[PDB]
Design a protein around this ligand. Structure first.
Ligand SMILES: O=c1ccn([C@@H]2O[C@H](COP(=O)(O)OP(=O)(O)O)[C@@H](O)[C@H]2O)c(=O)[nH]1
Ligand SMILES: [Mn+2]
Lengths: 9, 494
């Protein structure tokens, strides 16, 4: 429903 | 005007803090209590690769107009975004910061920030959505390069120069920073993985794609080289102003949120430019799971409408895969798209097939939809022909998932078919064994329908259900439909 957060380092 | 270090953040943020006992997520869908605890210039970790501190850019970089639209943003987050731009960017490169107040509930959220050095506030007289709001900001921009940022971001060390360098070298490059994560619960700033690209499945929802083994291997020579991306996240990017304009700005008929990132991504690639993610440019963003604001007609409808406008203009025949993946989208009016279709023609853009082959070869095209074959399962058992043919009974046996005597199809003529044989109700008397017989379109005895969440098989025109309670006494039978486990059948595609 929104822009998803990217996998972190 | 006041220099940002002298802005009274306490007075500004204090007028909208969460009251004790009140939900800290209600207004923004992120923790406002935690956002409000942070100073406007709070320090954040340098998430850049070590090689970034050695990479150079030209001295004569073009200044940029930073456009930030916002609708009912948390004051602390909005202020912090503005301050991060001012503190982390070379002053000579920030021509101005244009805040487009998209009809926020309280006009003071934006107006009060207008006293800060370089900040210009433009309040929409009515709700316009992010697409029309960004265009208003872009149209008012005085610099030669545009920078768009969401109203809840935090720029990192030397975030701007690497982006400007790309555009200064080639005006057709639309670039974005690696977008770091600002936790929505406790606002900690964490670095995003650098092995990502922007992408999407056929439902046309933006997602992050992990680089293939070969793509990662090829970047070992220079881990901070630009990353060509099929799609940009959408809210954080830099673009030559004249290029933004001549390429078609944004589709002005798109509303609120959604689909514009897909549209500009397809348009830029298909029409001659390129999209890049620049590793040495880092900007944090508060990712959320739900939008806190209203969508006239609902977010589902609005997203579908905007997406249809993008798909109908840019995807050619491939748009059909979107409708196949999202059935509900076919029944959503999307308005006139002639100006956009004409734009595509004028720009002499390439077909979507070209885009898939040259820009997003990783996206696999789905097979065509047709009748599927599979197994009809009950527990760990599967409907089995028992190796029988015409006039023979059927039963159940442990599923082997190897097809054969356990492969069936639920046809459009409503038959339960195995090759050219169909389940036949030779006798409707409850308890009667069913039999296999050649499939005939006009044999009412071979008609079945799935019921109760596709968990049972009922003989059409009767209250008889396929039942395995007689499996040990001759084979499957028809029995009055009831709560029995022996009447449960699930069709599993395979
Ligand atoms: O009607 C609207 C909807 C969104 N926005 C602004 O557009 C940005 C991106 O929206 P949002 O952050 O909700 O999207 P997300 O990042 O979760 O995908 C934000 O700065 C919003 O506050 C706006 O100005 N008007
Ligand atoms: Mn956002």
């Amino acid at each position: 429903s929104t822009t998803p957060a990217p996998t972190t380092k | 005007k006041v220099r940002w270090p002298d802005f009274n953040q306490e007075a500004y943020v204090g007028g909208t803090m969460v009251r004790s006992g009140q939900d800290p997520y209600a207004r923004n869908k992120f923790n406002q209590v935690e956002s409000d605890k942070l100073r406007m210039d709070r320090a954040i970790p340098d998430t850049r690769h070590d090689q970034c501190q050695r990479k150079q850019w030209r001295v004569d970089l073009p200044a940029t107009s930073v456009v930030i639209t916002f609708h009912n943003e948390a004051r602390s987050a909005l202020l912090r975004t503005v301050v991060s731009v001012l503190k982390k960017s070379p002053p000579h490169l920030i021509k101005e910061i244009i805040l487009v107040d998209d009809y926020s509930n309280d006009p003071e959220d934006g107006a009060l920030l207008g006293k800060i050095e370089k900040v210009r506030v433009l309040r929409n007289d009515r709700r316009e959505g992010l697409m029309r709001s960004r265009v208003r900001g872009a149209d008012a921009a005085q610099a030669k390069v545009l920078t768009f940022l969401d109203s809840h971001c935090e720029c990192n060390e030397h975030w701007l120069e690497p982006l400007l360098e790309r555009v200064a070298e080639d005006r057709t490059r639309v670039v974005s920073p690696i977008i770091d994560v600002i936790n929505m619960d406790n606002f900690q700033y964490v670095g995003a993985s650098a092995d990502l690209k922007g992408g999407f499945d056929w439902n046309l929802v933006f997602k992050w794609d992990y680089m293939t083994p070969e793509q990662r291997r090829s970047r070992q020579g220079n881990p901070v080289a630009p990353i060509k991306t099929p799609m940009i996240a959408g809210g954080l990017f830099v673009m030559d102003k004249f290029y933004f304009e001549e390429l078609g700005k944004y589709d002005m008929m798109m509303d609120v949120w959604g689909g514009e990132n897909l549209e500009i991504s397809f348009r830029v690639w298909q029409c001659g430019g390129s999209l890049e993610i620049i590793p040495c440019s880092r900007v944090g963003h508060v990712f959320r799971k739900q939008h806190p604001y209203t969508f006239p007609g609902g977010s589902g409808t609005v997203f579908a409408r905007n997406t249809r406008r993008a798909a109908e203009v840019w995807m050619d025949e491939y748009k059909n895969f979107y409708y196949a993946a999202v059935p509900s989208a076919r029944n959503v009016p999307y308005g006139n798209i002639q100006s956009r279709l004409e734009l595509r023609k004028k720009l002499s853009c390439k077909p979507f097939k070209w885009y898939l082959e040259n820009v997003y070869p990783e996206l696999r095209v789905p097979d065509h939809q047709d009748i599927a074959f599979g197994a009809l399962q009950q527990g760990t058992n599967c409907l089995d022909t028992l190796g029988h043919f015409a006039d023979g009974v059927v039963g159940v046996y442990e599923c082997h998932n190897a097809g054969g005597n356990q492969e069936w199809a639920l046809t459009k003529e409503k038959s339960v078919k195995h090759m050219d044989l169909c389940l036949t109700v030779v006798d409707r008397a409850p308890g009667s064994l069913i039999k296999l017989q050649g499939c005939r379109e006009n044999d009412s005895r071979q008609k079945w329908e799935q019921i109760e969440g596709n968990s049972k098989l009922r003989h059409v025109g009767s209250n008889l259900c396929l039942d395995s309670r007689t499996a040990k006494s001759g084979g499957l039978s028809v029995e009055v439909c009831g709560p029995a486990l022996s009447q449960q059948w699930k069709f599993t595609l395979n």
